[PDB]
Design a protein around this ligand. Structure first.
Ligand code: PTY
Ligand code: LMT
Ligand code: LMT
Ligand code: MIY
Ligand code: DDR
Ligand code: 8K6
Ligand code: MYS
Ligand code: MYS
Ligand code: DDQ
Ligand code: D10
Ligand code: D10
Ligand code: D10
Ligand code: HEX
Ligand code: HEX
Ligand code: HEX
Ligand code: CL
Lengths: 156, 1033, 144, 48, 48, 48
């Protein structure tokens, strides 16, 4: 990578909007990835930094960038209950049916943590409700196992 | 009492002899160390959970132990760390004065009953309870120069052949091995295990069965059949002793009849218990021993005994093995004693020369030469009675008291010589009268100096214990100085001195002394004429006094505050911190570059570099390291350019160019536990189960606010580590049950392979040592290797890990901190230039009060000390001033006259402040104790002036000015003699640039500057004070 | 008699008995205390808004207050007037018998699926030559 | 229910308990309040 | 239990004795490792 | 037994000195003490 690529990964994670702003002006690599394959957008999505997610996507960040285990920023945002970021990523063309190495989708992760608003947004953008993981489990199979009767009704 | 001993000089001699014998005995038997025990008693609980993450360690070990640390006496606070190396360290800090043995056994007893609650793996490893100590006597490095041994090989040799013998050496307390004894390492192969349908579970099962001590019984044991002839013990299975035996451990017998041994599925060798640390000495593999001095032991005798034992181990060393001494404090302590003994001897010689310059008879010069050693020796007997040691603080405590000791000797003798010269009285009658003038004052002085120094002993915490060393040393020496002045010195004067004819001031002599006596008698008239002029216009000198008092107050506020000055001790540390996730190999490359620098660009200064990969200041891990630098002899490093400070600044500047690493050198502190003056130690606490992430957010919020106040706060950072990406793997319970695969077999296979498992013990050459099973490195490096590990199902099918597992990347803590049983995050920082520690702390409290709900805080360590130390000061200053006043009031029989003495304080303080400010030194303890001794001697000079003046007015019925002029005339010579001797006595300390010069400069500079002004101003100002006070009241 | 030495001598003898005691008694935690038989004081805790029950207040005192008070110098013994929360699994014998299960199966499953597993590290020491990744492996953690 | 450790001072321990409770009070959930239904120390202070 | 004197000495006696450093006023240390499986390490201290 | 025998000479030396100094102080003399202390051998031979 590069020196500024490291500072952007740190700034994006930390939630330092002003530092990200200056780094985007100076031309810090938006596609800079750490050893596990996490871009600044991965980190911003994980820690729930909405403005940085939007600024990175404006500066040509790969919305469908995946780590060394095949997980995308939408996977992270959907799993940790960041509703606004999930909407932004999906508007900027995030693959709603993105499968990691385990066959897990953003819908599976949202269903597992009982993020009802996010599950509805994924279904609104055409989330495959019948999509199975490596163990042949759907988002509905997770809801009945978790005992989330509200979520199970949405997924029908 | 002086009258009693004037008529009884043999009795006076008997007392002096008894004092010298007691002191002579004390010198031989007194303990010797660099510094005494300063820090409050602390007990550390250490446990190891092999292959455990920070949260696993915290939630199974740390929290369980913390919840059970109840019903223990005199606990101040409890703090702990749980990191990803599988290590937990809980530190329990106790009240100053607590019995450290009782503290340890109480902690240890509460742990014992909490052991059944801990994981069986942690119970197997053990949980060490030790008394926390940072101060090493010396570090013995053990290296191999011919490259025939690894660090593991050397560590095993030291543990087996050296460590125990060093632990038994005279004066040796504790010995720490920098490494471990051998462990039987079974490096498993997953391809070979799967091939024979075996797992790590089978390897552990087989080792436990085939490496064990089995109890059998006895032939013809009781109760026997009567007529039995033989009774013998039955020996069955005993532990395995070699790699060969472990390789022949039977795992499986195949259908055809072929045997699967442990050597078929694993690589077997004697290796290290763990591989986290890589130690190198100038690039070569190294182990070592960290040796601590035993309680009440002699550092110099112990270091000599350690080297004597290592010397007779030399012949039995393997080829290439060499002993090196990267750290040893005794050469520094050797110099400290020599330089202090030198100062005391030179001081006695300087007094002899001054005594002869003025009095000009060899009989007079003998009385101080006898008296001062008698006081010094007596002081040692009193230190021994108090249970003190010969250490840096107590040694410099006696150097600072030289001025007071010397004055007692001069004042008594000089006053007899004058009385004989002025009246023509014979020595004995002259001595009786001379003592009659001063004996009441000398006692008054003893009480005034007691009032000054004794309260300094009653400060709490670390700094209080340091001040207590100087306090008892000075008070003891001062107390014995006055007893010797009231008993021995008068008896010596009366019996040894030669009579002087009335009016003989030596003006009729020829040569140097004829000239000098005429010069000084003329100078005394110039002085009294000058005081006469001053006392006609006191108003303008009262104004000049307020300029001095204001100038003093101004310089006090401006002078930067410190604890103890940093010394060139022939060593300094270099920190190496790489970013998160950085491997052991990457850290070694930075360390190799750091070492290569010191041996190339500082080859004339540096002797060796001790590079330790896997250990930082506070943290551990693969991305942390430290390079302990050892310098050549002080003599080979001339000038400031080749000193630790110059080298430090040179190295730190050179290493700022290094990429993907934070590297810098720095000098060791005098005492590590003090920290930094202006430095604070802050704890941010989770008070309502908010969790790790929310306390992190609250920390970031506080750190950001602290950054907006650079005028008040500087370098406000976390002491801990940041969250790192960690490999979360979920076992599918349904899939495991569906395939007939047990979860115990899964978690054992994963844990044993990737983390390592301590199975049981074996006996290597008559020494019990551990057996570890772990994956051969190459099969436990990357996530793809997870699938290569197979677990046997109930039906006999080998199932890969991928079939029943799913993984993802997440962030978690590699080091979780707790404070008083609650989740915490330690924040270090310091007050900005010009700002006090107190102001910086008050802002941090103000910033802390604006943090989210359920986020509290607390002050720990030096900050906890600083608060409880600062709350006492006002009371201890008040008591000192009040008792000084009351003592002077009893002496002079006056509520007003005492003010004329107490007004002298600033005259000595301004000179100390000017000298310290000019030379660019700090307000350290040596300077502060220097002020009290400077204030003490000037106060004594004023007391004798005011006593002589008051007595002249009372007895001879003289006027205020007449008495004042006649007093200061009589007191001029003795004041100049003491000042001339003492200022020359501390001149070597000021100009010193050698080893231990930092402390010598701090003691010398402030005292010399203070004495110059105290002497010059007081002789002119004490006359003014007395007249002004007497006129007013 | 020095109460410190009395406690130390008593426990030295207790530790010889500890291994012979049932595993259930050892796991409840045996305590050696040197205190008066009577109460110095009772520190009562209530909710004036009536938002928290007797059990909620009892858990809070145990989880947030009791430990720090128990560690305070001079406090020989602390007695909670209530109980700290535990994860209570109230078994049904009719439902257990239906699926052919017993309390033994329930206990075995909890120990297996409520586990804190030490799973080692990726690129852990001693590593191979040219290792770039170093990360903690996180397996099963305690249920919350 | 707090019991005084053997030979410890009742008043010093009672003061140390109140000091530790004072640190907890600010982080109390809404409504929670410390009451003093039984204390043997007030008598000793007042009686002296 | 069941261990000979040599086994007892290597696994128990030497493990305990090597940790008996840094103890105040210790004059000498004697021990017996026996066929019964028994260890007895006696530490004799200075008078007073 | 070894300790008892080893420290006996120094005990006699310090004992003789203390008696001498005590006599010197009491009687304000060096001659009286020395005249007295010369008697010790007359006693010690009788004991032997
Ligand atoms: C293993 C044990 C370790 C311990 C180590 C051993 C230490 C031993 C020290 C104890 C022994 C004390 C030494 C005694 C010395 C006495 C000297 C006698 C001088 C002398 O004969 O002259 C006298 C007169 O002189 C006078 O009038 C003399 C007056 C001035 C005093 C002389 C100087 C004394 C110096 C002190 C010694 C310092 C040693 C330091 C330790 C005559 O006697 P008289 O009775 O006729 O006199 C009339 C009295 N009115
Ligand atoms: C009333 C009569 C009394 C009899 C004594 C008379 C005293 C004066 C004369 C003494 C005879 C010797 O004379 C003496 O010589 C020496 C050596 O050069 C001088 O030496 C001394 O003074 C000079 C200055 O003059 C200094 O620089 C020098 O440090 C000092 O040693 C004396 O100043 C002088 O007084
Ligand atoms: C800041 C550093 C400097 C501070 C140093 C202060 C103390 C050391 C300096 C000593 C000066 C004393 O010197 C002395 O001054 C006084 C001034 O009142 C002079 O006194 C003069 O003025 C007074 C008042 O009008 C007259 O009564 C007197 O007849 C006349 O001689 C003396 O002739 C002189 O000998
Ligand atoms: C930090 N320290 C002083 C040093 C310095 C140089 C070294 O070369 C070493 C250490 C620490 C010691 C601690 C020991 C410890 N023990 C005494 C066996 C130990 O249990 C560990 C451990 N991580 O559990 C080691 O790393 C250790 O084996 C080790 O490898 C060390 C080591 O090699
Ligand atoms: C003659 C009257 C002297 C009064 C001064 C006595 C001061 C003693 C205070 C004390 O007990 O503590 C010593 C303290 C230890 O931290 O050391 C010090 O801080 C040195 C004190 C130097 C300044 C004294 C005040 C003069 C300013 C006008
Ligand atoms: C004859 C001289 C010796 C006298 C010194 C004794 C002084 C003892 C110090 C007592 C400490 C009092 C501390 C008070 C702190 C209360 C804070 C408001
Ligand atoms: C610690 C300082 C205490 C000073 C106490 C004040 C003393 C006042 C002096 C009065 C003198 C009375 C003169 C005779 C009338
Ligand atoms: C801290 C309490 C003691 C303070 C020192 C007392 C000083 C008493 C001064 C009395 C002056 C009386 C003047 C008589 C006119
Ligand atoms: C108790 C405070 C110290 C005061 C000491 C003053 C002693 C004066 C004795 C005067 N004297 C009776 C000898 O003449
Ligand atoms: C070797 C031990 C005896 C000598 C120690 C030095 C003592 C001098 C202190 C001033
Ligand atoms: C006006 C200046 C006079 C200086 C007199 C001081 C003499 C002191 C010499 C010891
Ligand atoms: C310290 C020695 C004391 C013994 C002699 C007693 C002195 C009395 C002389 C009048
Ligand atoms: C007046 C007798 C004083 C001597 C006692 C040490
Ligand atoms: C330092 C311990 C012995 C002191 C003799 C009274
Ligand atoms: C009157 C004689 C004084 C005794 C000193 C011990
Ligand atoms: Cl948490």
């Amino acid at each position: 990578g590069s020196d500024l690529g490291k500072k952007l990964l740190e700034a994006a994670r930390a939630g330092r909007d002003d530092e990200v702003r200056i780094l985007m002006a100076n031309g810090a690599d938006v596609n800079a990835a750490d050893v596990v394959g996490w871009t600044p957008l991965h980190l911003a999505a994980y820690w729930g930094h909405l403005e940085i997610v939007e600024v990175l996507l404006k500066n040509g960040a790969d919305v469908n960038a995946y780590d060394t285990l095949g997980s995308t920023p939408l996977h992270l945002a959907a799993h940790f209950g960041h509703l606004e970021i999930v909407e932004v990523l999906l508007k900027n063309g995030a693959d709603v049916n993105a499968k990691d190495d385990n066959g897990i989708t953003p819908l599976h992760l949202a269903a597992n943590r009982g993020h009802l608003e996010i599950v509805e947004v994924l279904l609104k953008y055409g989330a495959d409700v019948n999509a199975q993981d490596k163990f042949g489990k759907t988002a509905f199979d997770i809801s009945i196992n978790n005992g989330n009767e509200d979520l199970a009704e949405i997924l029908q | 009492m002086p009258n009693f001993f004037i008529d009884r000089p043999i009795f006076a001699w008997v007392i002096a002899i008894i004092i010298m014998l007691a002191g002579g005995l004390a010198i031989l038997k007194l303990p010797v160390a660099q510094y005494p025990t300063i820090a409050p008693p602390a007990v550390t609980i250490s446990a190891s959970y092999p292959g455990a993450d920070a949260k696993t360690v915290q939630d199974t070990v740390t929290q369980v132990i913390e919840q059970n640390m109840n019903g223990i006496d005199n606990l101040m606070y409890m703090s702990s760390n749980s990191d990803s190396t599988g290590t937990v360290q809980i530190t329990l800090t106790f009240e100053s004065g607590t019995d450290a043995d009782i503290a340890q056994v109480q902690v240890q007893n509460k742990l014992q009953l909490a052991m059944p609650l801990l994981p069986q793996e942690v119970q197997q490893q053990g949980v060490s309870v030790e008394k926390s100590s940072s101060s090493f006597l010396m570090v013995v490095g053990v290296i191999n120069t011919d490259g025939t041994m690894t660090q593991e090989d050397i560590s095993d040799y030291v543990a087996a052949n050296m460590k125990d013998a060093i632990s038994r050496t005279s004066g040796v307390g504790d010995v720490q091995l920098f490494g471990s004894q051998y462990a039987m390492r079974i490096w498993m192969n997953p391809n070979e295990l799967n091939k024979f349908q075996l797992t790590p579970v089978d390897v552990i099962t087989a080792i436990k069965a085939q490496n064990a001590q089995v109890a059998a019984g006895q032939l013809g044991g009781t109760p026997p059949v009567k007529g039995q002839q033989l009774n013998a013990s039955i020996i069955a299975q005993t532990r395995l002793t070699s790699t060969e035996e472990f390789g022949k451990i039977l795992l499986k017998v195949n259908q055809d009849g072929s045997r699967v041994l442990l050597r078929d599925v694993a690589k077997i060798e004697l290796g290290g218990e763990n591989y986290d640390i890589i130690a190198e000495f100038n690039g070569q593999p190294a182990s070592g021993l960290g040796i601590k001095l035993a309680t009440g032991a002699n550092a110099l005798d112990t270091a000599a005994a350690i080297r004597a034992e290592l010397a007779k181990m030399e012949p039995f060393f393997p080829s290439g093995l060499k002993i090196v001494y990267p750290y040893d404090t005794t050469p520094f302590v050797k110099i400290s004693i020599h330089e202090v003994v030198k100062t005391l001897v030179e001081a006695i010689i300087l007094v002899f020369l001054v005594m002869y310059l003025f009095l000009q008879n060899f009989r007079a010069t003998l009385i101080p030469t006898i008296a001062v050693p008698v006081v010094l020796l007596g002081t040692f007997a009193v230190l021994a009675a108090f249970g003190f040691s010969i250490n840096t603080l107590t040694m410099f405590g006696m150097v600072l008291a030289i001025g007071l000791l010397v004055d007692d000797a001069i004042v008594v003798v000089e006053n007899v010589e004058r009385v004989m010269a002025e009246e023509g009285l014979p020595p004995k009658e002259a001595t009786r009268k001379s003592m009659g003038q001063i004996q009441g004052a000398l006692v008054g002085i003893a009480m005034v100096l007691s009032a000054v120094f004794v309260p300094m002993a009653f400060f709490g915490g670390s700094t209080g214990a340091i001040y207590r060393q100087f306090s008892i040393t000075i008070v003891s020496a001062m107390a014995l100085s006055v007893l010797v002045a009231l008993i021995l010195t008068p008896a010596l004067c009366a019996t040894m001195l030669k009579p002087i004819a009335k009016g003989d001031h030596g003006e009729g002599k020829k040569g140097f002394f004829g000239w000098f006596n005429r010069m000084f008698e003329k100078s005394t008239h110039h002085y009294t004429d000058s005081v006469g002029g001053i006392l006609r216009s006191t108003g303008r000198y009262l104004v000049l006094y307020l300029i001095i008092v204001v100038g003093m107050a101004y310089l006090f506020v401006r002078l930067p505050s410190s604890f103890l000055p940093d010394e060139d001790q022939g060593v300094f540390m270099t920190m190496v911190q790489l970013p998160a996730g950085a491997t052991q190999e990457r850290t070694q490359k930075v360390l190799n570059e750091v070492t290569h620098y010191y041996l190339t660009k500082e080859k004339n200064n540096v002797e060796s570099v001790f590079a330790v990969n896997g250990f930082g200041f506070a943290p551990r891990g693969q991305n942390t390291g430290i390079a302990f630098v050892s310098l050549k002899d002080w003599a080979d490093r001339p000038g400031e350019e080749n000193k630790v400070e110059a080298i430090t600044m040179r190295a730190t500047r050179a290493f700022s160019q290094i990429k993907d690493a934070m590297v810098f050198a720095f000098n060791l502190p005098a005492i590590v536990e003090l920290g930094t003056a202006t430095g604070f130690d802050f704890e941010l606490i989770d008070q309502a189960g908010l969790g790790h992430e929310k306390l992190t957010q609250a920390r970031n919020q506080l750190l950001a606010e602290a950054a907006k106040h650079p005028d008040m706060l500087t370098s406000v950072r976390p002491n801990g580590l940041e969250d790192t990406p960690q490999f979360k793997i979920d076992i599918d319970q349904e899939k495991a049950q569906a395939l007939g695969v047990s979860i115990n077999d899964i978690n054992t296979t994963l844990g044993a392979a990737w983390g390592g498992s301590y199975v049981n013990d074996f006996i290597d050459r008559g020494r019990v040592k551990k057996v570890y099973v772990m994956s051969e490195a190459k099969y436990r490096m990357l996530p793809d290797d997870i699938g290569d590990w197979y677990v046997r199902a109930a039906d006999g099918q080998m199932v890969p890990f991928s079939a029943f597992s799913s993984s993802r990347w997440e962030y978690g803590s590699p080091r979780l901190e707790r404070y008083n049983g609650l989740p915490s995050m330690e924040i270090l920082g310091q007050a900005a230039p010009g700002k006090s520690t107190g102001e910086a702390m008050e802002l941090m409290e103000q910033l802390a009060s604006k943090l989210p709900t359920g986020v509290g805080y607390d002050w720990t360590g030096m900050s906890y000390q600083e608060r409880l130390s600062g709350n006492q000061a006002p009371s201890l200053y008040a008591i000192s001033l009040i008792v000084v006043f009351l003592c002077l009031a009893a002496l002079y029989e006056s509520w007003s006259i005492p003010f004329s003495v107490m007004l002298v304080v600033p005259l000595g303080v301004i000179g100390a402040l000017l000298a310290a400010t000019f030379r660019g030194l700090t307000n350290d303890v040596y300077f502060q104790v220097g002020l009290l001794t400077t204030i003490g001697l000037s106060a004594k000079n004023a007391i004798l002036i005011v006593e002589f003046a008051k007595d002249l007015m009372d007895k001879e019925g003289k006027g205020l000015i007449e008495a004042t002029l006649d007093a200061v005339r009589m007191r001029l010579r003795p004041i100049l003699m003491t000042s001339l001797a003492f200022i020359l006595g501390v001149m070597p300390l000021v100009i010193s640039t050698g080893a231990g010069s930092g402390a010598q400069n701090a003691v010398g500079t402030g005292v010399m500057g203070g004495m110059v002004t105290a002497t010059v101003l007081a002789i002119f100002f004490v006359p003014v004070f007395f007249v002004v006070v007497r006129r007013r009241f």
